Design an enzyme around this catalytic site. Structure first.
Site, PDB file in Angstrom:
ATOM      1  N   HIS D  41      -3.990   3.015   9.693  1.00  0.00           N
ATOM      2  CA  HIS D  41      -4.374   4.637   9.861  1.00  0.00           C
ATOM      3  C   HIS D  41      -4.641   5.518   9.213  1.00  0.00           C
ATOM      4  O   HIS D  41      -5.462   6.975   9.082  1.00  0.00           O
ATOM      5  CB  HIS D  41      -2.599   4.764  10.996  1.00  0.00           C
ATOM      6  CG  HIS D  41      -2.374   6.539  10.294  1.00  0.00           C
ATOM      7  ND1 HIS D  41      -1.915   7.064   9.547  1.00  0.00           N
ATOM      8  CD2 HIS D  41      -2.988   7.282  11.757  1.00  0.00           C
ATOM      9  CE1 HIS D  41      -1.430   7.794   9.492  1.00  0.00           C
ATOM     10  NE2 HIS D  41      -1.835   8.441  10.799  1.00  0.00           N
ATOM     11  N   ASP D  90      -1.194  -1.105  13.071  1.00  0.00           N
ATOM     12  CA  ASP D  90      -1.393  -0.681  11.500  1.00  0.00           C
ATOM     13  C   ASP D  90      -1.891  -1.580  10.446  1.00  0.00           C
ATOM     14  O   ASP D  90      -1.372  -1.430   9.407  1.00  0.00           O
ATOM     15  CB  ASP D  90      -0.509   0.714  11.697  1.00  0.00           C
ATOM     16  CG  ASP D  90      -1.156   1.901  10.832  1.00  0.00           C
ATOM     17  OD1 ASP D  90      -2.380   1.582  10.556  1.00  0.00           O
ATOM     18  OD2 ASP D  90      -0.303   2.377   9.852  1.00  0.00           O
ATOM     19  N   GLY D 184       2.186  11.206   1.497  1.00  0.00           N
ATOM     20  CA  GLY D 184       1.686  10.468   0.864  1.00  0.00           C
ATOM     21  C   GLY D 184       1.485   9.578   0.904  1.00  0.00           C
ATOM     22  O   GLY D 184       0.479   9.121   0.501  1.00  0.00           O
ATOM     23  N   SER D 186       1.109   6.956   2.357  1.00  0.00           N
ATOM     24  CA  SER D 186       1.493   5.838   3.235  1.00  0.00           C
ATOM     25  C   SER D 186       0.884   4.535   3.044  1.00  0.00           C
ATOM     26  O   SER D 186       0.328   4.481   2.198  1.00  0.00           O
ATOM     27  CB  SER D 186       0.855   6.797   4.284  1.00  0.00           C
TER      28      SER D 186
END
Ligand SMILES: *[C@@H]1O[C@H](CO)[C@@H](O)[C@H](O)[C@H]1NC(C)=O
Ligand SMILES: *[C@@H]1O[C@H](CO)[C@@H](O)[C@H](O)[C@H]1NC(C)=O
Ligand SMILES: *[C@@H]1O[C@H](CO)[C@@H](O)[C@H](O)[C@H]1NC(C)=O
Lengths: 232, 215, 46, 241, 104, 128
Positions: D41, D90, D184, D186
């Site tokens: 993602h 994901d 931030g 991820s």
């Protein structure tokens, strides 16, 4: 009145805080719209096509414009939109064939001065006598530079046309001789266009009896692999 | 003073530009400068406030061009922080292009046209590759009359001439000039200008260059 | 074959910048009548 | 990472950065060879060549320049059945290119972090550590690398309900501790240690929610479910299945 | 001052793609010189907004405070039109100027 | 065997060592510009029997730590806003609130050292 110009207040306070609030995690893009940078265009891109939430807070006014760029399929032709070109190559009655090129302008009026850009097939070359016969008057022109070159190393040619008709096809033909022999012959090409616009052009390929111009491609949906060799 | 490395840029490339910061005596100084990048529409898209200190009056900057962008005349606008009323500008075109690999020069005999010259406007076309060597090919030359911003093409003036040894000649006859406009009175043409457009195609047919000389 | 450079030994040209040599040089050389000459070596592109 | 302390160079070598022209966007984990495990993602650009990869950086403003080797990006690999609405599947892979002179990319600092093969290897309430470059509290900060301890919690449908999927996702969060990777950071690593201190990548930072509230734990996409999916693209080399 | 860029080698040696070359730069002592090499194809497409020396002096001359080639209607007009303010203790002085821009 | 052109990295230059043409056995040492650091221990490329050494060096702009507004003061200058990295060149301004006078350097920029040119000033009440 002097006190009115003293107590005169500068500008209506502008201070927007616009936060993109996405359920997922990425970075934290925050936006401070201030008076000193009110006209600054603040663009924020998002790769996923989805409904999302925008949260603004503070004094002042703004405009929000969500504009999505993409690629749309085109029914209208991307190539040969203003010109029709049909190219045929047949064995003439040492290997010599006959190249025939028929073009027609897709407009309300006739086309003006046009260019025929002919590339020979690997190993083939135009017949000198035939070129001199096409070049005499008849609203055609082949430069001396092209006509003087020997049959060898004459793999490109430019035939100039004074005009091409829009009412019907204007057709020409000349003989091509095989000067070099190769197991794999690369297809030749013909490209017509008008001098005042190079983008509105048409290009066709020819290969001695191989439909259209295209190589043996294997296509399905978007994705094509080359099939220009033995099956196994 | 703003200096961009080039005059035109493709979408995706980086614009390298230097801002020279001097005073009214042209001597390098160290001050704070505000820079605004502006799109052809007029909207500023990137502001900045940098310093010229310890830079010997030269300020090296760069700006990255997005891939999807609107073509046309972009502007860089800089001004000293202390004087926001003195705004210095430089433009740069953004466009999709390829190098033409050769140059075409449309050069009239005279820098003007005497209205009573029966010979007409004689123009020499000189085409040569960018590395010096001359060019062999064919040129299509066409003339037009410009009145302010209204251009009227002259279809009768279209000519096809051979470019031999990098040189060609094409004459716009006075008769064609008078016949092209629907006014027999030649005195009305005084105050107007002529423009010439020449398209040179190589014998290889692999490159084409259109050039113009107006005014 | 004979009397020709092998394919693997040919290095294709690939450096075709529209602009380059974005460099900074200082004239620190001993002046000659006020002029300080600086010889700068550069590698041309393809 | 809400809580936690500033990471130092030696501690977590397997941490990997992804920085574009506009700051740094998330970060992945090195799983051996010339491959990086991130979330699908966060990076979604078919204009991949600009992406760049940083390793052993620890602090974004004053690197030590010593063994701070960064490598270009060759090719991206996204999951075929990725859903943008539910954030399912994901996961994504990164291939780092090296010059033809050397057969493989030699990064002598970062240590691989292995791949889990079964969801039964680790259970909830286990001490796991998620580390990256996120934003504690709401403060932008994010200059130095942060790491913190979290616990795995079972049946996350109590807090999120239908939006959570236990086959393809996993939740890790501390009650009232609020120590939670956020914004931030991820696609970062959710690393847990075994009895031999073998280092595993139990999950990567997927979507989650607003950090802080212990009644809303962070959600991470489970790696162990996509073990065979990675194997198809990167082959059978490395750790024993 | 002066700034000249010329060949730092002989005129028998011809430039070849990739070949090292020596560039002779001769300018003022201590001056910082900034360089740029541009393909002439760029100028075939667009040759506008190019930094020259003539354009620099143009900007300087457009910010000039003088508005006339010379002299004036009176002794005060000479000072005002030449971008000067004269003021004596006896009272002979130039009129005030409240216009940044010259008269049309 | 002449290698290829070692390529130009953004905001940097390279010099050839041990020769004058990209031939077998030369070295191409790189060095970034003023305000740009050469991250990575690898800084050279060497022409071997195949090609050059691994990849191409990178030049990154030095960054400065963001500075908050002093007590009884605000910073409304500089770039596009809050609490973010400030790279080389950019400059900020300090203006104390009404009733407070500046007590130090009013302006400062991102210096070479990844630090600010001056130190953060103070805002003190106006006193005569
Ligand atoms: C939570 O995990 C810890 C591990 O340190 C364990 O001691 C404790 O019993 C667990 N509690 C529950 C309710 O599972
Ligand atoms: C999962 O089961 C119920 C759902 O009915 C849920 O409320 C509870 O929190 C969970 N229990 C366990 C033991 O995970
Ligand atoms: C594993 O980690 C524990 C943590 O304290 C440590 O004591 C131990 O030495 C490590 N190694 C092994 C083999 O247990």
């Amino acid at each position: 009145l002097a006190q009115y110009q003293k107590d005169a207040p500068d500008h209506q306070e502008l201070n927007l805080d616009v936060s993109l609030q996405l359920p997922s995690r990425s970075s934290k893009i925050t936006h401070r719209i201030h008076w000193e940078s009110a006209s600054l265009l603040r663009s924020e891109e998002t790769k996923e096509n989805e409904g999302f939430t925008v949260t603004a807070e503070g004094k002042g006014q703004g405009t929000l414009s969500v504009v999505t760029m993409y690629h749309a399929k085109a029914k209208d032709q991307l190539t040969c939109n203003k010109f029709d070109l049909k190219v045929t190559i047949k064995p003439a009655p040492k290997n010599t064939m006959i190249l025939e090129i028929c073009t027609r302008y897709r407009g309300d009026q006739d086309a003006t001065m046009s260019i025929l850009d002919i590339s020979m097939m690997t190993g083939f070359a135009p017949d000198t006598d035939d070129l001199k016969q096409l070049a005499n008057g008849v609203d055609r022109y082949i430069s001396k530079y092209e006509l003087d070159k020997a049959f060898s190393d004459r793999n490109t040619l430019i035939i100039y046309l004074d005009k091409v008709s829009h009412s019907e096809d204007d057709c020409l033909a000349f003989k091509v001789h095989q000067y070099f022999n190769v197991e794999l012959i690369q297809p030749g090409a013909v490209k017509v266009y008008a001098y005042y616009n190079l983008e509105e052009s048409c290009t066709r390929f020819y290969h001695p009896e191989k439909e259209d111009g295209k190589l043996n491609k294997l296509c399905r949906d978007e994705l094509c692999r080359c099939a220009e060799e033995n099956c196994f | 003073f703003i200096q961009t490395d080039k005059t035109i840029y493709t979408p995706g490339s980086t614009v390298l530009y230097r801002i020279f910061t001097v005073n009214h005596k042209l001597l390098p100084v160290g001050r704070t400068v505000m820079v605004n990048i502006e799109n052809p529409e007029g909207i500023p898209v990137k502001q900045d406030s940098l310093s010229s200190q310890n830079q010997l009056g030269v300020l090296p900057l760069s700006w990255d061009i997005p891939e999807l962008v609107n073509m046309g005349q972009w502007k860089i606008r800089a001004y000293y922080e202390n004087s926001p009323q003195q705004v210095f500008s430089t433009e740069f075109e953004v466009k999709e292009y390829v190098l033409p690999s050769f140059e075409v020069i449309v050069e009239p005999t005279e820098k003007f046209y005497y209205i009573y010259n029966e010979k007409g406007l004689e123009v020499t076309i000189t085409a040569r590759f960018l590395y010096g060597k001359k060019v062999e090919g064919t040129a299509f030359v066409i003339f037009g009359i410009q009145d302010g911003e209204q251009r009227i093409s002259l279809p009768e003036s279209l000519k096809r001439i051979p470019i031999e040894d990098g040189s060609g000649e094409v004459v716009l006859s006075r008769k064609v000039l008078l016949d092209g406009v629907q006014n027999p009175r030649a005195e009305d043409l005084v105050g107007k200008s002529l423009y010439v457009s020449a398209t040179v195609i190589l014998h290889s047919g692999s490159d084409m260059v259109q050039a113009e000389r107006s005014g | 074959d004979e009397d020709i450079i092998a394919e693997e030994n040919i290095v294709s040209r690939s450096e075709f910048p529209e602009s380059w040599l974005w460099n900074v040089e200082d004239l620190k050389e001993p002046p000659k009548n006020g002029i300080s000459t600086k010889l700068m070596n550069i590698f041309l592109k393809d | 990472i809400v809580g936690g302390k500033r990471a130092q160079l030696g501690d977590l070598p397997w941490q990997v950065a992804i920085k574009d022209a506009s700051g740094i966007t998330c970060g992945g984990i090195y799983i051996g060879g010339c491959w990086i495990l991130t979330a699908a993602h966060c990076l979604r650009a078919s204009k991949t060549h600009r992406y760049q990869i940083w390793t052993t950086v620890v602090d974004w403003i004053h690197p030590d320049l010593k063994r701070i080797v960064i490598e270009y990006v060759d090719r991206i690999i996204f999951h075929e059945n990725y859903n943008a609405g539910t954030y399912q599947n994901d996961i994504a892979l990164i291939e780092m290119k090296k010059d033809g002179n050397k057969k493989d990319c030699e990064l002598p600092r970062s240590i691989p972090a292995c791949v889990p093969w079964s969801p039964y290897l680790f259970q909830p309430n286990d001490t796991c550590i998620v580390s990256g470059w996120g934003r504690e509290k709401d403060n932008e900060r994010v200059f130095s690398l942060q790491w913190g301890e979290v616990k795995l919690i079972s049946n996350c449908s109590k807090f999120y309900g239908n939006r959570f999927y236990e086959k393809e996702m996993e939740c890790a969060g501390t009650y009232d501790g609020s120590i939670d990777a956020c914004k931030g950071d991820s696609g970062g690593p959710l690393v847990c240690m075994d009895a031999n201190n073998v280092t595993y990548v139990w999950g990567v930072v997927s979507w989650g929610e607003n950090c802080g509230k212990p009644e809303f734990p962070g959600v991470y996409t489970k790696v162990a479910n996509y073990f065979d999916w990675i194997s198809y693209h990167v082959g059978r080399p490395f750790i024993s299945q | 001052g002066s700034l000249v860029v010329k060949s730092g080698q002989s005129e028998d040696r011809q430039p070849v793609p990739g070949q090292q070359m020596t560039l002779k730069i001769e300018g003022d002592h201590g001056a910082r010189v900034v360089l740029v090499a541009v393909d002439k194809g760029v100028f075939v497409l667009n040759k506008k907004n190019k930094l020259t020396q003539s354009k620099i002096w143009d900007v300087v001359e457009k910010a000039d405070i003088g508005c006339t080639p010379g002299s004036g209607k009176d002794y005060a007009g000479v000072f005002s039109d030449a971008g000067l303010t004269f003021t004596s203790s006896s009272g002979q002085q130039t009129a005030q100027r409240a216009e940044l821009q010259c008269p049309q | 065997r002449p290698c290829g052109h070692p390529g130009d990295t953004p905001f940097g230059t390279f010099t050839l060592t041990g020769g004058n043409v990209f031939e077998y056995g030369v070295k191409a040492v790189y060095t970034c510009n003023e305000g740009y650091q050469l991250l990575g221990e690898i800084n050279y490329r060497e022409c071997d029997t195949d090609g050059w050494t691994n990849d191409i060096p990178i030049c990154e702009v030095v960054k400065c730590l963001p500075v908050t507004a002093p007590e009884n003061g605000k910073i409304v200058s500089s770039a596009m806003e809050p609490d973010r990295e400030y790279h080389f060149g950019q400059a900020v301004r300090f203006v104390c609130n009404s009733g407070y006078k500046i007590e130090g350097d009013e302006e400062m920029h991102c210096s070479d050292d990844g630090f600010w040119s001056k130190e953060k000033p103070k805002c003190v009440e106006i006193s005569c």
